[PDB]
Structure formats: structure tokens, C-alpha cells
Design a protein around this ligand. Structure first.
Ligand code: ZN
Lengths: 934, 94, 98, 36, 35
DNA sequence: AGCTCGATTTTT
DNA sequence: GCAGAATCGCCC
């Protein structure tokens, strides 16, 4: 059985009405996409603030009555975002800077993109969709919509039924909801003005939802993409080719020696992404515990509304490095430029990136001229990234651009320049600004852009095979200890690590390395370590005895071990931000294209283009290519998904009489029902892999991995004890003037140690010999390139160096993954001008006076030495990936895939990345103790 | 380069050469020269990045910068030395 | 099971589906435990070859020509073996057989 | 392709009456049509 | 029809056919029996 | 009446 | 600039 079969009958969506007198408007604004002057905005779907507790995210939607006596049911999940469309001016903006709507409109035209075109009718008047007796001036109005019928919402084809109102509690607020049904539930018809339409809602979806999906396919005709997605949902067109006519190609593809095969592969990859991504998004999903806003731990110490709003701002700062990485990285998913051809045979077609390529003119599928290109434009100068490239990253949407600018306000400036206050009182106040007219100089988007200028990427026109950067929620089962997935199942490496934490608990050390009793002096400091060393060395024996008595080939199983991370495919598992909707959807569409490339190449090698255009070639071949993709993309090493059949148990169900309800009369009927679709494709995870052991076989690479053995002078200060010798310095050497670094470097060269005025000499001679002895033993034995910060990491390093020695792995360092974790800090506002608001600034002396008493919140990332404890906290992650493809072993001829962890491009991403083969990075923010309870 | 890379390189160049004397006053003078009054709020996360390989030194640098801040001298390398330079047992081991 | 007959006769159903079913068979029948076969491309090295003048030979006159030549088919499916198996050891697990 | 059983009593007298014995007919070709 | 070149029809069939191999073990025994 | 088996090559 | 890999599940 399955979650689809178990879901109940219901409507295609709801209109929610919230009372303005009691609803928490400043809280929802911190999670929203509001800009100054908006008429619509997006907010997340959350139980206890935007929907009532116990909301069903999975449903059977009643969408068609073939005659008045039969119903058809479609199984679908909800769409992740809620659209706020009536009295929306009552919700505060997320960003204060003026002029964004005109800037978006101008920039959409120079890139040749399609603007929203309104229907010839007016928007529905309040009295058409409001319940009986409620005052339209007293309420806030918003839509929740199912993933299968959201194009019908956009196109004005749903019907609202006010007589079927239900009263619901949303947090404290007494709210109301009205159901939405597709006009195909009325076979005799309803009048065209009786259907629900709002032009501001449809325009908001055009910009904030559909334009970014068009950018992910390299399509400009957004309105035609919405029309073909609607017909695919309502008329079962998944195996019919449909996007190929909308495609466009650059001069590097048209001039190519293999251009005819390249145009077919690029087109077929996009067709497959449009067939499969909507099906996986519509599927029935698990309900995460993070969807319940009133059980979020982050509020637990708050008293009153101001404390709750300030807690949400700290929560948002912890997510900002994920969002700013997708802006600053040259290889961001937002800058994917198309497909190109060389690499080995199955890698020969690949995904490309570059903003320079995205500015160029294009040609159509029949090699005729199409878009004519843009020549470019500001304060960053000629040939460099400009504010228009940030508008392009935000899909020309003022709602998305406002929330991007809000996250960029947490970022530090890095000068490669006028002082901040002489810029704000000077050139920012000029009447020439097309955004503020100089009348809001401290919050203006051009002021934020000027501050962050040297962190934006370069503008690229090349076609190299690089990794691309993805963002989203992690899955349940990550393998990120030092030997990754080594002996994960059959005792297991997981059980070995649990045994070590139990021994460390008997020594008074917790899972984060905190002591129940701090060391008193030299004897106690030596005693503390000798007990941990003996406890680790005891567990190595019991483990090596288990491997021996079972004849397990552990000495060869080390050679093939990988680190593993799971990228989740559930849309409801993502963090409660509307920018993460776009980052998740665009990551999924990109991964489906990259998986499809060799499948399309092998089919076209057998069935050549012979001078046909891609739309002609797809007309014959696409139905067969869908079935090859379903067989060869899934369970082959990257993507996992489960097929299922959906069934309804009863032959009839209790439903309202929709003909009576349209005339205002409410009573029940047992309508006969059957499913309009039976097959469902439930997505599970995308799997990311990194190889642990270099085996010396590739002779070009050895100099990056090789272990030296000669006796260095830095062996104590770069050894295993230096962080502890610093943490305990004031207890080891009471009131000494010396730095801990100089004391131990002086010992490392002169062989002498200071003895406190009443303390005993020989006690310190022993401390010195312990430090010397263990540091030389570590210099000889170590293949894990870490200086440990806590006793748990010290213990785990000692353990894994023992296993690698029993395997004969002594010549090379192993690969490492390091987590970059956000830390939030308050700083003086002098260089953070946005704290002044829309205020007029008249002089640099007044800017200095007004900022002198103020503080700004900022975020920096710190490197963890221990990724596996971060992975236990169910983190939000950002990482680079390449999907590599290869043949099977033992004479097999099938294609298999791996998603391999890669590198970030662009010097503005994070200062910890500023200069390797043997160290790779991931950004991580934990969710346990923020949105999920321990 | 970013200016924070040049500060970091200049500190690793001092600490890798300073011998037979403790380095914290010469590191603090190079920070007060390069950042001036902005040292008064230098955080541990910023200090650890600037110290690079020698990030263990950060607590002693921050304790030293608080003495300059609270003693009310101006933020310049000449005044920093004039305050700091105005304001042991050792057994041998086998 | 995925593409049901819905009262169509087999010739009507095959008209839409058969080209896809050929490609499923090639992927799922070969190297899956009974039948083995190797796909290959066939190529001819020379652009012309020594052949009799067939127009003269039809009229009884015999002499050679270097006729330009190319392949009318390139893909070949070379069959290898069909494999027959018989289990050696009964493990006692199926209690009806012992 | 699992090895099975012959049906029909006329096939060969050695088959006239098991789970645990199976039969194949075989004629050698080395020393008949191919040289050792 | 005709049989192929590689048949495994000794008492334990394809047991240890590749990696000493069961084929090599049978060749060793025939050499001892030759002596 | 008459096991269960993820599969390919290798080839003596 | 920045390896290599037949794959699925299982979740202690
Ligand atoms: Zn301005």
C-alpha cells in the first residue's frame, strides 16, 4: 500500500481569509517576498500560521464530471508556496529599496523575455468569492493550490463555491476557507465571469514561478511554456514531444562540426525534464515535522511579538550563506547556459555555464535568426558583472529580487574606495538614480550592489566541462565519518563508533567533547589523555578480533569506500523560504537533463538525424526515448524513485451536491467515483559520492597525496595537542606572560619549560615528555590531515589511523570533506548603511552620527573538523556536483552514473576557500533545535 | 587579492620569522597599523581567519587589543608600542 | 500492463506500440542469463573495388572496373550461445522435497 | 534455461520407471568429423 | 543441435571455474593417475 | 509425475 | 587547474 491510495477526496485548492485585527502580519512578512509597492506576494505553506493544524498535503482532487452522475479523481500533493492577493498592502515588505518593478520590466525586455499578458476580462470582484456576510475590508486573502491544477489557477479556469465555506483556526486567528474546483466539474457549463480570476496573482506566478523554469530549459516564451504544462496535466501528453519548437541555440552550437546531433541531444534532454519533473513534484509526499510552526524550537525562550520577530531574523541569517553562494559562484545553477560537446564517450556531451553566453543572439531549430542579443550596460565598470545580471538571476521578478537583496544585506564586504558615509551622502544621493531618485540612498539596491561589488563573479563566454552548485535539504542516511560507507552493513563501522562514544562516556566526555570535570593541572592533563588513548586502543583490539574470526576482507574493503550524502527529493523538506522553491525546482530540472545526455546520444547514434530538425526527428522517436529513460535513469547510481499504483477503496464517496452549492444550497450526495490516472512515480533521493583512498595507481597525481616522514620543527604546534595546550594554558601555567604558541615553540627548539612558583619541577618535566612523545608518534603514524579541536575528534582520528595501518595504507593522506557552518554576529553599523532605512541623508557627519549608536547583524562561516556530527542534525546543504557516466564490469554493456562532489568557482564565495585534490567543502546549517525538536 | 589576504600573508610572514621573543605585540602593532580604530571590535572569527596557520594565537591578541581600547590611547602603531612596552623559572629537559 | 489493449485487436495495438517494444526486447533479452549476442559495425576499407563490368557481362563481354561502393546496412547482431543450467546441491530448505 | 524432463514412454528404455537424476542424449564429433 | 566450446559437467559443475581452479584440480589428479 | 537462480567476460 | 566508480535495499 502507498500514501496516494490512502489520501482522501477533496477540492482542487482553497481560498483562505484571515482577520486583519488579530493575524501576526510582521511574522509572515519575515518569511515573505514583499517589495515596496507590491499588489501580490508569496509566503510558505505552514501549519499554525498560513494553514490550520492537521492540513492534508496529499489529496484525491475531484476535477471532472463526465456527466452529472460520475466523478473523476486525480491524486496530487499541494504546491509548496501560498499566493497572497487581497489586501496584500497590509503585509510589510522584506526589503525597503524603491523602484524594483520598473527595473525588472526594463531588464526582461533587453534579454528578450515574455511579460505577463492579462486576460480581456476584469479580476473577480470580492462579492463573487467571499463567504456570505464577511466584510472584504476586514480580511487578508490568499490561495493554496494543488500541484496538478496550478496552471488552471493561472489561466482563470477554476470556480470558487462560497456556500461550501469552512471555519478554521490558524494559530490564534479565527479564519475561513472556500474551496476551488476546475470548471470541468460543471458539464452543462458555468458563465465565463463566474470563474475565478485575479490578474495580480497570475502576474506574480508568471514572474516568481514560471520564468525561472523557462530559464532552466533556455526558453524565452514563458506564456507558451505555461500552456504546454497545462495540456500535459489535463490531457495525459507526457509521452508526446512538445518543447522542441520553443528551443533556441547559440553560435558555438550552430558552428559545431556535430551541430545536427548536438541540437537533437539538447532538445531531447529538455523534453525528458518536462515529461518527468512535474510527475515527481505532483506525487504523494511524506509530511515533515518541520511543517508545524507552533512546535518550532527556535521560539521556546521568546516572550511577546518583538522577541518572536527578532528570533525569525536570526533564523534567516543562518540560511543566508546558501543563498549568497548561488549568487557569488561562477558555477551556480542560476548561470547554466546549455549543452556542449567535447572526455570519454559517455561524458562527451555535458552542461555549460556563463553569463556572457546568456547575453548572445540565437538561432531557431530550422537555423534561422531568433533573438538578436544584448551588448550589456555602472560602478563595477566595463565587461564586469552589473545589477542587470542580479536581476537575471532573480528571474526578472521584483518579489524574488527583494528577498535576494534581504539575504545579501547579511554579507560582509571585501574590498579588492570612498568611505561608506561619503558614498551614501555623495553619489548615492544623486537625482540620476533610476531607483530612488537619490531620495532613499542608504537602502537603495545600487548602494547594496556598490558595497558587495568585488564578490560578484566574472562574465564568461567559454564552453568547459565544470561541476554546478545545488542547494536543498539532506536525506536521512549520510555516511560522512573519516572512512565513509566502509562496513556500513554486514560489527558495522556505525556500531564501532557507538562503542567508542560509550567508552568516552565512562571517562566523563559527551558526544560534542564537553567534560564533566576540567583538568586541574599537569598530572590531570596527562591522565585525561592516557585514559582516552587506552580506551581507543582497547576498542581496536575487539574490532580486529571480529574481522579475523569472520575472515572478512577488510584490507580490500577500505580501497573501495566512499563518503555519501543524500540530497532529498521531497519539496516539503526544504526550508520555509520562497527562494528555496526556485533553487530546488531548478536543481531537479538540471540533474534530469545531465542524467539524460548519454541515453539520448546512444539512441541518436543508432537512429541518426540525417539533416532533420529536432521537432521532425522527435515526432517519430520520442515515445521510445521516454521508455529508455525510465529504464536507464533510475536505480543506476544517482536517482532513486519508486513506481506505484493508486487505488480508491469505495465505489462512491460523501461529497457536496455541487449543482445545489453553485445556487447557494448545501447538502450531501454519494457520487460514484473512479481514478483518471493510476500510475504514480514517487521520488526518493539524489546520491552524492566522494572517494576516500588514493591507491597510488595514477602516477601523475601522487605529489598531492604523498606522506612525508622527516622530523619537522613544527611537530608540537602542528601536532595533536596544541589546541588543548591553548584551551588549558591558564591552568597549566598560572599567570605566565608567554603565549602558548611561543612556550611550546621555545620547547620545540631549546628543550626547556617554565615551573610556577610553588609547583614541582619533575611534574613539568613529565608533561613536556608526554607532549614530545605523542607529537613524534603522530608525525610518524598520521594519514588524516586534521588538528583536532575536541576529545571526540582526537579519539576518532586515533581510531581511524589504526584501521588504515592494519590495511597497509601508510604512503598517502586520505581525502577529507569539511563542513562550513554559519555563525551570526552583531557588529557596529558604520559600514552597514541599510540599518538607517528610507531616511534622507544630507551629510557624511550626519551619517556618522546616526550610525554611531547602531548595530548590524552579519554572518560568517567557520570550518568544522568533523562533518559527521553536523550530518546528525539533518542539515540544509549547498555543494558542487558533476554527474560522471561509465560502463558496467564483467563484460556488461549498460551505462551507470555517479554524482561526484566537486569544487566552487569564483573568489567571492567564501574567504575559507581562498588559496586542493585532497580537501573538499560543503556548506551546512543544522535543523534540529531550530525547526525540529530533539 | 582582497585586502584581508594581504593582512593574512603579512602576519604569517611575521610569525614564521620571529625567534627568541614572544610575537603578540608585533602582531598587534601590524593589525593596529592596517585597521586602526576598526581593531576595537575585531571578533574571534575574523581574528582566526587573519592569523591563518597560527589561529591558536587569537585569544591572546583579543585580550591585548582590549587593553589598548580600555587604556584610552589612540589607534596608531606608535601609541600602541608606547602603552604596551611601558605596561622566569625555566628547567631544561632531556 | 502499462499500455492496455482496451478492446483493440493486436494489429491495431501493434501499429502504435511495436517500435518501442523492439527496443525493450534488445535491452532486456540479451546478456540477462540465457541468450548472448554481440552488436558490431561493419565497414569496407576501400572507396572502390575490382569487379566485373556487369553491363558488358550481360552482353557476353568480360572485363574489370573499379566501381565506387558503400554499405547498405552497417549494424550486425552476431549470436553466440544459449546457456542451459542445472542446480547441483539441495540445501534442505524446501521441506516438501527432502 | 533450466534442464528438464522428456515426455512419452516411447523415447528410450533407459528413461522407463526422479528429482535427482536428469538425462541428455550425446554423440561425439572428435574422431568422426573433426581430427584429434 | 551442436554444443559450444565451454561446458561445466563434472560432479560440482561451475564450482571454482575461475579465481587453484576446479579445472586445474582435475588436471592435477589425471597427472597423478598417469604416474 | 519433475528445487532455485542479479547478469555479462575470462577459456584452461 | 581540481582522481574513480555495475547498481538497487538495509538504517542497527
Ligand atoms: Zn538610488
Amino acid at each position: 500500500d502507498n500514501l496516494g491510495s490512502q489520501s482522501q477526496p477533496g477540492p482542487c485548492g482553497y481560498i483562505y481569509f484571515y482577520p486583519l485585527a488579530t493575524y501576526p502580519l510582521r511574522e509572515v512578512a519575515t518569511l515573505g517576498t514583499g517589495y515596496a509597492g507590491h499588489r501580490c506576494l508569496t509566503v510558505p505553506l505552514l501549519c499554525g500560521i498560513t494553514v490550520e493544524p492537521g492540513f492534508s498535503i496529499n489529496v484525491k482532487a475531484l476535477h471532472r464530471r463526465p456527466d452529472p452522475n460520475c466523478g473523476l479523481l486525480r491524486a496530487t500533493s499541494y504546491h509548496r508556496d501560498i499566493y497572497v492577493f487581497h489586501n496584500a498592502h497590509m503585509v510589510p515588505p522584506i526589503f525597503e529599496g524603491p523602484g524594483l518593478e520598473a527595473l525588472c520590466g526594463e531588464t526582461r525586455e533587453v534579454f528578450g523575455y515574455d511579460a505577463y499578458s492579462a486576460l480581456p476580462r476584469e479580476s473577480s470582484k470580492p462579492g463573487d468569492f467571499f463567504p456570505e456576510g464577511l466584510d472584504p475590508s476586514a480580511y487578508l486573502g490568499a490561495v493554496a493550490i494543488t500541484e496538478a491544477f496550478k496552471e488552471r489557477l493561472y489561466s482563470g479556469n477554476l470556480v470558487a463555491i462560497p456556500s461550501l465555506k469552512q471555519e478554521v483556526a490558524v494559530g490564534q486567528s479565527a479564519s475561513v476557507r472556500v474551496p476551488l474546483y476546475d470548471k470541468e466539474v460543471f458539464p452543462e457549463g458555468v458563465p465565463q465571469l463566474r470563474q475565478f480570476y485575479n490578474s495580480d496573482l497570475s502576474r506574480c506566478m508568471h514572474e516568481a514561478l514560471y520564468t525561472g523554469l523557462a530559464q532552466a530549459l533556455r526558453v524565452r516564451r514563458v506564456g507558451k511554456l505555461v500552456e504546454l504544462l497545462e495540456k500535459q496535466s489535463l490531457q495525459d501528453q507526457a509521452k508526446v514531444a512538445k518543447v522542441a519548437p520553443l528551443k533556441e541555440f547559440p553560435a558555438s552550437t550552430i558552428s559545431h562540426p556535430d551541430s545536427g546531433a548536438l541540437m537533437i541531444v539538447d532538445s531531447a534532454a529538455c523534453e525528458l525534464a518536462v515529461s518527468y519533473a512535474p510527475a515527481m513534484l505532483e506525487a504523494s509526499h511524506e509530511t515533515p515535522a518541520s511543517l508545524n510552526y507552533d512546535s518550532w524550537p527556535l521560539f521556546a525562550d521568546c516572550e511577546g511579538p518583538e522577541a518572536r520577530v527578532a528570533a525569525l531574523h536570526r533564523y534567516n541569517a543562518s540560511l543566508a550563506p546558501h543563498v549568497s553562494t548561488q549568487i557569488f559562484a561562477t558555477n551556480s545553477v542560476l548561470y547554466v547556459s546549455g549543452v556542449s560537446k567535447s572526455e570519454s564517450l559517455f561524458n562527451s556531451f555535458y552542461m555549460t555555464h556563463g553569463l556572457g553566453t546568456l547575453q548572445e543572439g540565437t538561432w531557431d531549430p530550422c537555423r534561422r535568426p531568433c533573438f538578436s542579443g544584448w551588448g550589456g550596460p555602472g560602478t563595477n565598470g566595463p565587461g564586469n558583472y552589473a545589477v542587470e545580471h542580479l536581476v537575471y538571476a532573480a528571474s526578472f521578478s521584483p518579489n524574488l529580487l527583494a528577498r535576494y537583496a534581504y539575504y545579501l544585506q547579511f554579507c560582509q564586504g571585501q574590498k579588492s574606495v570612498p568611505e561608506t558615509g561619503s558614498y551614501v551622502a555623495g553619489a548615492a544621493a544623486s537625482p540620476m538614480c533610476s531607483l530612488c531618485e537619490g531620495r532613499a540612498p542608504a537602502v537603495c539596491l545600487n548602494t547594496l550592489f556598490f558595497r558587495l561589488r568585488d564578490r560578484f563573479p566574472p562574465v564568461m563566454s567559454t564552453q568547459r566541462r565544470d561541476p554546478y552548485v545545488i542547494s536543498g535539504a539532506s536525506g536521512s542516511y549520510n555516511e560522512t565519518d573519516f572512512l565513509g560507507n566502509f562496513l556500513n552493513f554486514i560489527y558495522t563501522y556505525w556500531q564501532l563508533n557507538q562503542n567508542l562514544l560509550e567508552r568516552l562516556s565512562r571517562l566523563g566526555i559527551d558526544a560534542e567533547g564537553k567534560l564533566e570535570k576540567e583538568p586541574h593541572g599537569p598530572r590531570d592533563f596527562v591522565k585525561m589523555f592516557k585514559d582516552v588513548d587506552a580506551a581507543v586502543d582497547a576498542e581496536v583490539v575487539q574490532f580486529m578480533n571480529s574481522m579475523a574470526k569472520n575472515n572478512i576482507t577488510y584490507k580490500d574493503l577500505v580501497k573501495s569506500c566512499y563518503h555519501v550524502m543524500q540530497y532529498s527529493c521531497n519539496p516539503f523538506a526544504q526550508p520555509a523560504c520562497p527562494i528555496f522553491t526556485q533553487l530546488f525546482y531548478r536543481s531537479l530540472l538540471t540533474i534530469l537533463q545531465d542524467i539524460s545526455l548519454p541515453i539520448c546520444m546512444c539512441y541518436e547514434n543508432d537512429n541518426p538525424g540525417l539533416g532533420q530538425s529536432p521537432p521532425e526527428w522527435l515526432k517519430g522517436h520520442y515515445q521510445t526515448l521516454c521508455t529508455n529513460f525510465r529504464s536507464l535513469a533510475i536505480d543506476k547510481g544517482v536517482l532513486t524513485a519508486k513506481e506505484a499504483k493508486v487505488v480508491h477503496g469505495e465505489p462512491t464517496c460523501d461529497l457536496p451536491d455541487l449543482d445545489a452549492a453553485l445556487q447557494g444550497r448545501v447538502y450531501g450526495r454519494r457520487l460514484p467515483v473512479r481514478m483518471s490516472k493510476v500510475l504514480m512515480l514517487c521520488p526518493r533521493n539524489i546520491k552524492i559520492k566522494n572517494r576516500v583512498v588514493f591507491t597510488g595507481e595514477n602516477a601523475a597525481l601522487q605529489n598531492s597525496f604523498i606522506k612525508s616522514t622527516t622530523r619537522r620543527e613544527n611537530y608540537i604546534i602542528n601536532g595533536p595537542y596544541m589546541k588543548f595546550l591553548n584551551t588549558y594554558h591558564k591552568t597549566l601555567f598560572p599567570d605566565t606572560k608567554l603565549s602558548s604558541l611561543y612556550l611550546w615553540h621555545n620547547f620545540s627548539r631549546r628543550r626547556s619549560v617554565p615551573v610556577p612558583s610553588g609547583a614541582s619541577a619533575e611534574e613539568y618535566s613529565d608533561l613536556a615528555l608526554f607532549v614530545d612523545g605523542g607529537s613524534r608518534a603522530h608525525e610518524e603514524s598520521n594519514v588524516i590531515d586534521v588538528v583536532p579541536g575536541n576529545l571526540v575528534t582526537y579519539a576518532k582520528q586515533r581510531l581511524n589511523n589504526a584501521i588504515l595501518k592494519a590495511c597497509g595504507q601508510t604512503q598517502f593522506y586520505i581525502s577529507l570533506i569539511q563542513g562550513l557552518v554559519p555563525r551570526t554576529q552583531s557588529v557596529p553599523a558604520r559600514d552597514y548603511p541599510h540599518v538607517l532605512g528610507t531616511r534622507a541623508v544630507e551629510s557624511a557627519a550626519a551619517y556618522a552620527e546616526a550610525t554611531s549608536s547602531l548595530t548590524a547583524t552579519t554572518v560568517v562561516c567557520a570550518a568544522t573538523d568533523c562533518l559527521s556530527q553536523v550530518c546528525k542534525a539533518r542539515p540544509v546543504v549547498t555543494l558542487p556536483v558533476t554527474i560522471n557516466k561509465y560502463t558496467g564490469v564483467n563484460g556488461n554493456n549498460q551505462i551507470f552514473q555517479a554524482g561526484n562532489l566537486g569544487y566552487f568557482m569564483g573568489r567571492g564565495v567564501d574567504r575559507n576557500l581562498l588559496q586542493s585534490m585532497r580537501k573538499k567543502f560543503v556548506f551546512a546549517t543544522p535543523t534540529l533545535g531550530l525547526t525540529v525538536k530533539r | 587579492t582582497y585586502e584581508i589576504e594581504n593582512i593574512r600573508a603579512g602576519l604569517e610572514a611575521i610569525i614564521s620569522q620571529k625567534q627568541e621573543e614572544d610575537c603578540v605585540f608585533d602582531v598587534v602593532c601590524n593589525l593596529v597599523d592596517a585597521m586602526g580604530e576598526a581593531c576595537a571590535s575585531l571578533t574571534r572569527d575574523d581574528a582566526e581567519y587573519l592569523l591563518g596557520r597560527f589561529s591558536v594565537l587569537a585569544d591572546s591578541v583579543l585580550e591585548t587589543l582590549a587593553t589598548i581600547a580600555s587604556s584610552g590611547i589612540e589607534w596608531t602603531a606608535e601609541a600602541a608600542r608606547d602603552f604596551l612596552e611601558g605596561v622566569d623559572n625555566f628547567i631544561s629537559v632531556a
